[PDB]
């Protein structure tokens, strides 16, 4: 499994989606 | 691959101050290095998968 | 610094007392900014 | 400062364990679900605290325990009694009027607190009695002789303390820590039920009560008692003064870093010392 | 337009296919409150610097000054400041700030004597009658007393320090009266080796302005956000919610949208701090209302460019953002890049990268073109 | 600073005045630690 | 305490070793208009 997130968040530092979802990886599985 | 972070420099060190950004703007390009540096990480996690 | 909050030093100081302790600020934010990246770095070339 | 002749006994110092009582709130700042590393004046973990009685003996002996104490860098001290025999306490370098000391009773409708170069007597105590056999109420008068420059006064906290009974052991567990610093004396107090009889082992974080911004210099400190005049004991002839039984533990402060758990609610719940 | 701000980005006039992380978006506070308590009476300024004797120097007065609203234009009344030194802060920014407390060392000095009240000073009276911490925050006030401090046959009720065994220490004071004793012969009267600590000022009209009577009162300041007390006259405003504002709460300045919380502060308990030292929750001075605080939305804004000599259209990612939130920011203009994209209903779209605009979502399934994330992508096609 | 030596500061000076001396060997030390954690950082992914 | 002081351009330089320099001697024959020390604490003076 991947508030500490929100205060991350909070001050400039943001975390960007990978390209490909889990389920595109699934189906490349 | 790893989590894709982005960093804003300003709002990091100069959180919504005029008056500090000003002066870390006299510190060069240290941050569009930063910027680059973690746009290239994110790129190769995108890569890597 | 007196305050790690920059809105405490930009109240209660003028701007040539402020600035002292905004360089200070900025010149520990920065280095906590280039140790983050640079180890974001080695970790990359690590997963890569 | 009049005292009637009495049987004093002799101070004797028992020694017993802290376990982990003594851990109040740093600070005013609110922390939810949050393990906080914060280095303060705390009681250790596990270590002596010194224990005295105050009680009235069967065979007309009567043991008044107040005797001098340091404070050091802050106090740690836990009561347990079931008619208020500890009243107050006295706080000062020289405990004199050469020097201001500062003074914390329990007027029994109000809390009285002073900062005064009061002339206490040589062992200041208050006086309980009952008038016309239809009033019990307590004077000042055995405390000090004469108050001058005063420079501090706050009469407040309208509270009796223990209102609930003696239902398991006195419901009295009173515990109070009190600091000097910066100027400012802290007190931070909890009122904990006793299950079982003395010192219940457990947790319990000591909210803070009064921040008296009195900055006034103190190195000494001694408990207060209460003197009352007779008719406690039914079935007790003796005209004479008696006080209740009473125990009450000190422990001292030192310089310690401390991992506190705040709960969901903002309540330190556990504590870990890290130098035990 | 974000096609320029790609460009001066890139510091080139022609961009290649791609996205460009290009700027941040920031939505602006709309109104400013300040939530000050209901104190009213002024604070007793004009006991402490008028008043009709002030103690000495090694006998300084300590002031407290506390529950009041701390005025300081009525010092610029009474004052020809001859000294107006304030250390830690600004004397300008006195009127706007909250103090926990205010302490008034009130002393009469010597006119030469007025440089040695200051943190790390050397001299008679600044190491035997009034020493100041190195770490002060305050201010010092110091104005001429000739006219009241002194005496045609001499003024005599006034003392000073000028021996004694250690230098005091901040915070300190010393009314011993024991003879400084220099050696190690005991001292039993005034004699050899033998010389009395407190010496008379001694001051007259006649003397120069050097050595004339000088009135010095070091106020004291704890500036901590916690215990507030004390602040400066300024007109509290009234308290909104669910909107992006600049607040101050007794002197506490920050951004952000503040909301109704289901944190349950203790009575002791001020404000509310997140698990890395974050302020999450705030307490009213007025009502005692426990209050979320949440910083205006805000995050990456990246341009998506076919190419500039394929076409100068672009789209712009606002990234980790709701569609609805950037709407409503640009119908208030709140928005701090102001070159806000032309929207016409199907030109916004929301991904799980961000909200997405000037691109049209289709059904169709295409090579991955310009990575946009969370398996969206962009093309320039017909 | 004015000398590499801590307790020479300590010795020479008020805690006021020691305080920037102190601040600049801190700062100089420091950097030289990151340096050394970086190259050893490095060095360890080239064994590795 | 010297009876005669050289003028100020033809300054006297005096030269002091090779003795115990104890300076609360001179606390006793200055009224002390001026003690700045640079470079070191003058409450350290007695241990260096
Ligand atoms: C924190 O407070 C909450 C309420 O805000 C407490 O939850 C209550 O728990 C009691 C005891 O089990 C129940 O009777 C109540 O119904 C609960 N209330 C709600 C709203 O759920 C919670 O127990 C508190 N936390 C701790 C550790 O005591
Ligand atoms: C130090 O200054 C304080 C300022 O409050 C003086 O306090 C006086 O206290 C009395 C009550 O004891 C008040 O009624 C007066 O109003 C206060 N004085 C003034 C001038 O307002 C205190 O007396 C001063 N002490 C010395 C030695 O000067
Ligand atoms: C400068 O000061 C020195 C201090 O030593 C003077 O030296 C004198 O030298 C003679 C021998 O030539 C000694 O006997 C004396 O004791 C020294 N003088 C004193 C006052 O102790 C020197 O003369 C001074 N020069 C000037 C121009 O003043
Ligand atoms: C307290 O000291 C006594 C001395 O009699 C000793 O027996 C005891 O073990 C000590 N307690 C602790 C907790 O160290
Ligand atoms: C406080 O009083 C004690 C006892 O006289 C003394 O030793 C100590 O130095 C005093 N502290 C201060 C800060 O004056
Ligand atoms: C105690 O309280 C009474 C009122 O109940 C009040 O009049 C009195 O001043 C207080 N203090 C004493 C008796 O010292
Ligand atoms: C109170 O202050 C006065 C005036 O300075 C002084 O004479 C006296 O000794 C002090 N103490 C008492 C107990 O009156
Ligand atoms: C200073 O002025 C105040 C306010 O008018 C007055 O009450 C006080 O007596 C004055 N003090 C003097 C004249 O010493
Ligand atoms: C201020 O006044 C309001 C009513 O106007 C009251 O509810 C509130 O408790 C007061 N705040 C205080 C006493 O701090
Ligand atoms: C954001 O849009 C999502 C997806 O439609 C919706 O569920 C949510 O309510 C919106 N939230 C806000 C704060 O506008
Ligand atoms: C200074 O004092 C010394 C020591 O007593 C003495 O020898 C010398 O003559 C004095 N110098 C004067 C008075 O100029």
Redesign the pocket.
């Known amino acids: 499994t991947l508030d500490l997130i929100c205060a991350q968040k909070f001050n400039g530092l943001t975390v960007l989606p990978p390209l490909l979802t889990d389920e595109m990886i699934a189906q490349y599985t | 691959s790893m989590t894709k972070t982005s960093v804003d420099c300003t709002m990091y060190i100069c959180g919504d101050s005029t008056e500090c950004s000003n002066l870390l703007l006299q510190y060069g390009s240290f941050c569009t290095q930063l910027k680059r540096a973690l746009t290239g990480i994110a790129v190769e996690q995108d890569k890597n998968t | 610094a007196i305050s790690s909050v920059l809105n405490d030093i930009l109240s209660r100081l003028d701007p040539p007392e402020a600035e002292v302790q905004i360089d200070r600020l900025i010149t520990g934010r920065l280095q906590s900014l280039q140790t983050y990246v640079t180890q974001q770095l080695i970790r990359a070339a690590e997963i890569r | 400062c009049v005292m009637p002749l009495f049987n004093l006994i002799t101070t004797t110092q028992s020694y017993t364990n802290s376990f982990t009582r003594g851990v109040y709130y740093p600070d005013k700042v609110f922390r939810s679900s949050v393990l906080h590393l914060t280095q303060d004046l705390f009681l250790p973990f596990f270590s002596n605290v010194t224990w005295f009685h105050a009680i009235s003996g069967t065979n007309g002996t009567k043991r008044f325990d107040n005797p001098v104490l340091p404070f050091n860098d802050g106090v740690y001290f836990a009561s347990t009694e079931k008619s208020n025999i500890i009243r107050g306490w006295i706080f000062g370098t020289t405990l004199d009027s050469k020097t201001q000391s500062l003074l914390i009773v329990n007027n029994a409708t109000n809390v009285f607190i002073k900062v005064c170069e009061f002339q206490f007597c040589n062992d200041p105590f208050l006086d309980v009695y009952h008038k016309n056999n239809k009033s019990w109420m307590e004077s000042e008068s055995g405390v000090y002789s004469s108050a001058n420059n005063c420079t501090f006064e706050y009469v407040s906290q309208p509270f009796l303390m223990d209102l609930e009974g003696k239902q398991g052991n006195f419901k009295n567990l009173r515990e109070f820590v009190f600091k000097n610093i910066d100027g400012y004396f802290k007190i931070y107090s909890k009122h904990t039920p006793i299950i079982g009889r003395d010192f219940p082992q457990g947790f319990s974080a000591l909210e803070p009560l009064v921040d008296l911004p009195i900055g006034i210099n103190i190195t000494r400190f001694q408990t207060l008692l209460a003197l009352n005049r007779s008719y406690l004991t039914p079935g007790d002839s003796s005209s004479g003064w008696t006080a209740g039984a009473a125990d009450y533990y000190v422990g001292y402060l030192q310089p310690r870093t401390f991992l506190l758990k705040y709960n969901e609610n903002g309540t330190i719940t556990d504590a870990v010392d890290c130098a035990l | 337009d974000p096609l320029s701000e790609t460009k001066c980005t890139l510091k080139s006039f022609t961009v290649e296919k791609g996205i460009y992380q290009t700027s941040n978006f920031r939505v602006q506070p709309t109104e400013s409150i300040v939530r000050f308590p209901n104190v009213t009476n002024l604070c007793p300024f004009?006991e402490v610097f008028?008043?009709?004797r002030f103690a000495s120097v090694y006998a300084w007065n300590r002031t407290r000054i506390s529950n009041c609203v701390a005025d300081y234009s009525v010092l610029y009344n009474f004052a020809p400041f001859f000294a107006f030194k304030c250390y830690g802060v600004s004397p300008t920014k006195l009127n706007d700030l909250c103090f926990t407390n205010v302490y008034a060392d009130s002393f009469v000095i010597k006119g030469n004597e007025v440089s040695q009240i200051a943190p790390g000073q050397t001299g008679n009276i600044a190491d035997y009658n009034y020493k100041l911490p190195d770490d002060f925050t305050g201010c010092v006030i110091a104005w001429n007393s000739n006219k009241?401090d002194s005496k045609h046959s001499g003024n005599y009720d006034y003392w000073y320090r000028s021996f004694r065994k250690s230098k005091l220490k901040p915070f300190e004071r010393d009314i011993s009266t024991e003879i400084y004793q220099a050696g190690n012969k005991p001292c039993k009267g005034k004699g050899p080796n033998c010389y009395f600590p407190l010496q008379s000022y001694g001051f007259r009209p006649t003397y120069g302005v050097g050595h004339q009577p000088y009135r010095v009162v070091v106020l004291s300041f704890e500036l901590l956000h916690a215990p507030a007390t004390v602040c400066g006259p300024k007109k509290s405003t009234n308290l909104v919610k669910n909107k992006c504002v600049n607040f101050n709460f007794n002197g506490l300045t920050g951004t952000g949208v503040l909301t109704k919380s289901n944190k349950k502060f203790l009575p002791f308990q001020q404000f509310g701090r997140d698990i890395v030292d974050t302020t999450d929750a705030v307490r009213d001075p007025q009502t005692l209302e426990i209050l979320d605080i949440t910083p205006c939305s805000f995050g990456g804004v990246s341009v998506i460019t076919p190419g500039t000599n394929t076409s100068n259209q672009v789209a712009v990612l606002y990234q980790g953002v709701n569609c609805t939130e950037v709407s409503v920011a640009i119908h208030a203009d709140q928005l701090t890049p102001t070159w806000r994209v032309y929207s016409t209903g199907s030109n916004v779209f929301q991904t799980r990268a961000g909200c997405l605009i000037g691109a049209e979502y289709v059904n169709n399934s295409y090579e991955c073109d310009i990575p946009i994330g969370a398996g969206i992508c962009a093309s320039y096609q017909t």
């Open positions: 004009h008028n008043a009709t009241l």
